[PDB]
Design a protein around this ligand. Structure first.
Ligand code: CDL
Ligand code: BCL
Ligand code: BCL
Ligand code: BCL
Ligand code: BCL
Ligand code: BPH
Ligand code: BPH
Ligand code: SPO
Ligand code: LDA
Ligand code: LDA
Ligand code: LDA
Ligand code: CL
Ligand code: FE
Lengths: 301, 281, 239
């Protein structure tokens, strides 16, 4: 009894250069190699990639962020490669101290290098967002991917930009460090009277747990009905087959729910985007409107 | 009542137990033997939670809490009022979960589909049994288990966590979080991609899986494919919960000190242990 | 205060969202029916959504859902009881009649096309230059049923051109005709292909395709249905 987690047989044909529509083909690369390793689980083909202006702006901008942090990590290691690898998780690029408020006037060694790195990260993410929109437009597709990605951008923007501004200093932002961003996260909860009492944090968690429940069920189901070509979801939407019927009936007989092949993808996008949506509201309201979620919770309001 | 297409699927057979005795529906819901077992175990467990509410002196759902036995009971039975009800309810909850899984198996057999869903669910049951059974038995008391109440179970998470310092430092917990974050990123993309193709720009024809593959190649230079994303989703979410169970089975058993101090294995490796400067020099 | 207003707004949003999601998932299979196929009195709490129209590519028209629902085929089933909610016994051979886990849907009797308007699925012999790139090449292997009898041999792989994957094995039977087997219902072993769903004597009964270089959505459903139904219906002959 074969389970369809790994392919039993790979087949390969000519490289697929992809659909054209209104795409500027001058800006697609050539195809990369074919990975047989990847091809046990999914597609074997690497490439082509599209790189126009926003692509290169984003890629350059994102490397500058990455290098700006790494230059500061080397500096902290005293330029010793042994100390760099030993302490990698412990280095941190900290924002400016509370004194300097929302000013760009802090020295490199006390928060200016943080601001530089953040500027590069700001350019990198927003250019990448325009890119998810334009790549969809060129192919005549809905902008679902761009609007879903904005949900993620919302929480990132709250954490590093919108909240620090409302609180009146960059000191409130997140440091670029593996262990240091973990400590910040734990510190944040303690200083705000325990996030478990933040109702938005509670919902955020419900949606995170639910994203795992839903992808577990959805993935499991499509594999369970792949013996009727179930993973061919678009043609099953246009022309319901026994795969869509059996998938619907599993859900109905189990827990009395209705699920269409299209409808389950609406559950999927929303379960996911509501994680960071509710999340960013919960963080935005912390220390701006609510000092202490315990105290708030006692009054309920 | 039936979906327009449902009658042809409502045939006899597929049951694991009882032959045709419980082989019927109540409205949309398939029953089967494990439907009856699930109802028995659920009703019994709800009765016992109400009994717990009486003894505690509150009907408020935001206050009702059923606590495990205290540590000095070890792995013995306990008086109902002081952890015995938690013990019977835990047997009931386990019976209801396993019955629900075997019922999904009966539904899979009648529909002639794979058993991937009940298999995926068995991982959630594993995680539950880790917290209430495997970890407590390894640690020597039921009292290390979590209480059944809306806010009290959150106190237990907070207290259990902060027993080991900042629980972020548990390395299995880092991996588990990564799979949870990645699962949700993948679910967002999968939903968005299928809907962007089925629901294109106004007045345009439905796109094809070719457009879906093309969009991802254009964006990031790789496309896992329509079979691959469903394999990936099942794996990310199952892995998240595997590493979750693992991060707690090792906490209190092989490791009972502060988790941050565990990371000194890396820092005190002999070749860089004594080199001055950096953070740890 | 602001936080109470935010959390209260949010629950009103979420309630609208859940309504929208529930009615979106009613676009197939409604209205609900009694077992006799007449419309049920109780259709549930939410009403049917306003129809939406998919424009299919390659000049294949439009779909409108919700829209008129019929099976468009006879169901060889009979009631086993005098009240709602019991199983319906097959009146013939459920494998032949296409009921239970052998069920098929009357999908379009055309093949699925790729983004260029070409057939999505072809025999590998007609797909230049597709080849097996990894794993055992099943072409030439004998095919064994669940009764451990040899039913035929593999003479081709039918591949998905755009997604580059094996979808069916074309199997030659003792009488020189062929059948498609779904790739997800066979074990490729080193020296044979094993099929658990079917016994050797049920291979001839696999529905045949009207053209030998393409398979239609209707044919895929009849084939996949038939092979899946063998798990239940060919259990007497499995070992
Ligand atoms: C912070 C930023 C977070 C934004 C995240 C939004 C997720 C977007 C998901 C989605 O479906 O996007 C596709 C959707 C349409 O994509 P498209 O390519 O333009 O259309 C292609 C098809 O023609 C059309 O394709 P389609 O049919 O898939 O699109 C239809 C879609 C259209 O979707 C929308 O119109 C989005 C709805 C607004 C989202 C904002 C929610 C904010 C929450 C506030 C919480 C309050 C706190 C206090 O309809 C819905 O999903 C209905 C939503 C139901 C809302 C219920 C309202 C309850 C009212 C109370 C009673 O995107 C948008 O509509 C963009 C919205 C941008 C908002 C800023
Ligand atoms: C998993 C690790 C921790 C844990 C850490 C947390 C943290 C942190 C949070 C929760 C929160 C929740 N936890 Mg918990 N929780 C644990 C184990 C459980 C178990 C169990 C194993 O039996 C259950 C039933 C719950 C249930 C719950 C919910 C009350 C709530 C949201 C869950 C959700 O949306 O999931 C996803 C599932 C779905 C979306 C499907 C729908 C499930 C529904 C909502 C479940 C209803 C349960 C009901 C209230 C319990 C009574 C049922 C009886 C039959 C009477 N937790 C363990 C001990 N849990 C959140 C909260 O806000 O509560 C205060 C929260 O922030
Ligand atoms: C001691 C710690 C506190 C706590 C403090 C916090 C704080 C502080 C926060 C959370 C937040 C969250 N907490 Mg908490 N939390 C606690 C305990 C828990 C428990 C539990 C006990 O079981 C759970 C399950 C959670 C779960 C969660 C999540 C639901 C939520 C984060 C969602 C998310 O996806 O962010 C991950 C997604 C993002 C951060 C968005 C990133 C998007 C950007 C644009 C990506 C850029 C990538 C960049 C360019 C780099 C490129 C990389 C390479 C190309 C690969 N917390 C305790 C009580 N928690 C967050 C939240 O929303 O709060 C309401 C948050 O800010
Ligand atoms: C949500 C609240 C906190 C936060 C709490 C945590 C906790 C808790 C953990 C992480 C962990 C991670 N965080 Mg974090 N993290 C936050 C915001 C971020 C941001 C950002 C907003 O730009 C980035 C780039 C990261 C990046 C990272 C990685 C180092 C790591 C795994 C991420 C992952 O699986 O992605 C998805 C995969 C891709 C390929 C993309 N975090 C906010 C500030 N983060 C985990 C870790 O292992 O750190 C050592 C971990 O346990
Ligand atoms: C202050 C607290 C500590 C902390 C202490 C702990 C402790 C303690 C635990 C975790 C655990 C987890 N932590 Mg932590 N954790 C912290 C911060 C975080 C942060 C963050 C952003 O800071 C994140 C993202 C996480 C994330 C996580 C997850 C990896 C994991 C919870 C998921 C899980 O186990 O599901 C597993 C799912 C279940 C158990 C649900 C099973 C459902 C059952 C089978 C069915 C229920 C049916 C129901 C009754 C039916 C309802 C009725 C119907 C409506 C009819 N933690 C902080 C630093 N964390 C937990 C873990 O790993 O557990 C194994 C755990 O015990
Ligand atoms: C529902 C919200 C979830 C989500 C959604 C989401 N993320 C997204 C998207 C969406 C819908 C995209 O479209 C976009 C993308 O293109 O993904 C393939 C993206 C994206 N989410 C990413 C990361 C990411 N998302 C995260 C979280 C989440 N994203 C949520 C769980 C996290 C976490 C958990 O912290 C991370 C680390 C990237 C893969 C991508 C945005 C890439 C970007 O902005 O590029 C700028 C940087 C560079 C080009 C240089 C990189 C530095 C060097 C290492 C090279
Ligand atoms: C493994 C990946 C994720 C996952 C997957 C998953 N869950 C699943 C499935 C799958 C594949 C199903 O097939 C099954 C289903 O049918 O979903 C609709 C299910 C399911 N997962 C559910 C919940 C759930 N899953 C969770 C988690 C996860 N499930 C993982 C993150 C959580 C979390 C994170 O907390 C919850 C709350 C249900 C909706 C359903 C299982 C329903 C079930 O078992 O019903 C039988 C039992 C009853 C009807 C109730 C009996 C009650 C007891 C007798 C008494 C109460 C005891 C309990 C301990 C009280 C504690 C409450 C307090 C903590 C507040
Ligand atoms: C080996 O050496 C080389 C040379 C290769 C370099 C190596 C580099 C290494 C090892 C780097 C490692 C980097 C790490 C570990 C980074 C980790 C980052 C983390 C964990 C980030 C977490 C959160 C970040 C957030 C929330 C940031 C938000 C940022 C913004 C919202 C942008 C805000 C913008 C600001 C403040 C400025 C805007 C300015 C104007 C004028 C508008
Ligand atoms: C998640 C992306 C990478 C996945 C790669 C996993 C490789 C699995 C190899 C399977 C071995 C082949 N076999 C024996 C199953 O036919
Ligand atoms: C998931 C990340 C995968 C990234 C792979 C990108 C492939 C790019 C192809 C490189 C070929 C370049 N060139 C110019 C020779 O065609
Ligand atoms: C996509 C919609 C799915 C519905 C999920 C709703 C889960 C309920 C969460 C209850 C937690 C409420 N709380 C305590 C944070 O206020
Ligand atoms: Cl695993
Ligand atoms: Fe899907």
């Amino acid at each position: 009894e074969y389970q369809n987690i790994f392919s039993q047989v790979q087949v390969r044909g000519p490289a697929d250069l992809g659909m054209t529509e209104d795409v500027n083909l001058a800006n697609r690369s050539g195809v990369g190699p074919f990975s047989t390793l990847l091809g046990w689980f999914g597609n074997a083909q690497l490439g082509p990639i599209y790189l126009g202006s926003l692509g290169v702006l984003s890629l350059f901008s994102g490397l500058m962020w990455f290098f700006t942090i790494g230059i500061w990590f080397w500096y902290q290691a005293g330029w010793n490669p042994a100390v760099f690898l030993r302490d990698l998780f412990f280095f941190s690029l900290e924002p400016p101290a509370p004194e300097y408020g929302l000013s760009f006037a802090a020295p490199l060694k006390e928060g200016g290098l943080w601001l530089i790195a953040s500027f590069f990260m700001f350019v990198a993410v927003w250019s990448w967002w325009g890119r998810t929109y334009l790549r969809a437009q060129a192919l005549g597709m809905g902008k679902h991917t761009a609007w879903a990605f904005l949900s993620a951008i919302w929480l990132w923007m709250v954490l590093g930009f919108i909240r620090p501004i409302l609180m009146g200093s960059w000191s409130e932002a997140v440091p670029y460090g593996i262990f240091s961003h973990l400590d910040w996260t734990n510190n944040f909860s303690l200083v705000h009277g325990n996030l478990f009492y933040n109702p938005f944090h509670g919902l955020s968690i419900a949606f995170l747990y639910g994203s795992a429940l839903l992808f577990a069920m959805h993935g499991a189901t499509i594999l369970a009905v792949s013996r009727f070509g179930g993973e061919r979801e678009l043609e099953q939407i246009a022309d319901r087959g026994t795969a869509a019927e059996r998938a619907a009936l599993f859900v109905r007989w189990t827990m009395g729910f209705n699920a269409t092949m299209e409808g389950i993808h609406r559950w999927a996008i929303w379960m996911a985007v509501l994680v960071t949506l509710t999340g960013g509201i919960g963080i935005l309201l912390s220390g701006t409107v609510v000092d202490n979620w315990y105290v708030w919770g006692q009054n309920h309001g | 009542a039936l979906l327009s297409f449902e009658r042809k699927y409502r045939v006899p057979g597929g049951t694991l137990v009882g032959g045709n005795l419980f082989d019927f529906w109540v409205g949309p819901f398939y029953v089967g033997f494990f439907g009856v077992a699930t109802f028995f175990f659920a009703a019994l467990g709800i009765i016992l939670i109400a009994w717990s509410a009486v003894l505690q002196g509150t009907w408020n759902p935001q206050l009702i809490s059923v606590y495990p036995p205290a540590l000095e009971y070890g792995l013995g039975g306990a008086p109902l009022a002081k952890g015995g009800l938690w013990q019977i309810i835990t047997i009931c909850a386990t019976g209801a979960f396993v019955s629900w899984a075997l019922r999904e198996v009966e539904i899979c057999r009648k529909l002639g589909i794979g058993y991937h869903i009940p298999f995926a669910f068995a991982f959630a049951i594993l995680a539950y049994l880790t917290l209430v059974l495997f970890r407590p038995v390894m640690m020597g008391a039921w009292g290390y288990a979590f209480p059944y109440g809306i806010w009290t179970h959150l106190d237990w998470v907070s207290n259990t966590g902060y027993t080991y310092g900042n629980f972020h430092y548990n390395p299995a917990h880092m991996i588990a979080i990564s799979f949870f974050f990645t699962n949700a990123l993948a679910l967002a993309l999968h939903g968005a991609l299928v809907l962007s193709a089925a629901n294109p720009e106004k007045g345009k024809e439905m796109r094809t899986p070719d457009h879906e593959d093309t969009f991802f190649r254009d964006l990031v230079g790789y496309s896992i494919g329509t079979l691959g994303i469903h394999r990936l989703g099942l794996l990310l979410s199952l892995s998240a919960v595997f590493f979750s169970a693992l991060c707690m089975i090792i906490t209190g058993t092989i490791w009972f000190d502060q988790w941050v101090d565990w990371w000194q294995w890396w820092v005190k490796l002999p070749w860089w242990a004594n080199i001055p400067g950096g953070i740890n020099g | 205060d602001l936080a109470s207003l935010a959390i209260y707004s949010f629950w009103i949003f979420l309630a609208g969202l859940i309504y929208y999601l529930q009615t979106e998932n009613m676009r197939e299979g409604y209205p609900l029916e009694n077992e006799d196929g007449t419309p049920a009195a109780n259709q549930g709490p939410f009403p049917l959504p306003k129809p939406k129209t998919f424009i299919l590519p390659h000049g294949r028209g439009t779909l409108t859902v919700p829209g008129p629902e019929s099976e468009d085929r006879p169901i060889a089933l009979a009631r086993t009881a005098v009240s709602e909610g019991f199983p319906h016994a097959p009146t013939g051979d459920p494998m032949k009649d296409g009921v239970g886990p052998a069920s098929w849907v009357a999908r379009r009797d055309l093949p699925e096309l790729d983004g260029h308007g070409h057939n999505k699925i072809k025999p590998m012999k007609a797909a230049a230059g597709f080849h097996v790139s990894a794993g055992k090449n099943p072409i030439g292997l004998p095919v064994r049923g669940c009764d451990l009898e040899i039913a035929g041999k593999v003479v081709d792989i039918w591949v998905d051109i755009p997604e580059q994957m094996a979808r069916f094995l074309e199997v030659e039977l003792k009488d020189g005709s062929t059948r498609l087997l779904p790739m997800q219902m066979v074990k490729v072993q080193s020296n044979r292909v094993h099929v658990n769903a079917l016994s050797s004597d049920l291979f001839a009964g696999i529905p045949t395709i009207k053209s030998p270089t393409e398979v239609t959505l209707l044919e895929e459903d009849k084939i996949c249905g038939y092979v899946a139904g063998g798990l239940m219906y060919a259990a007497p002959k499995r070992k």
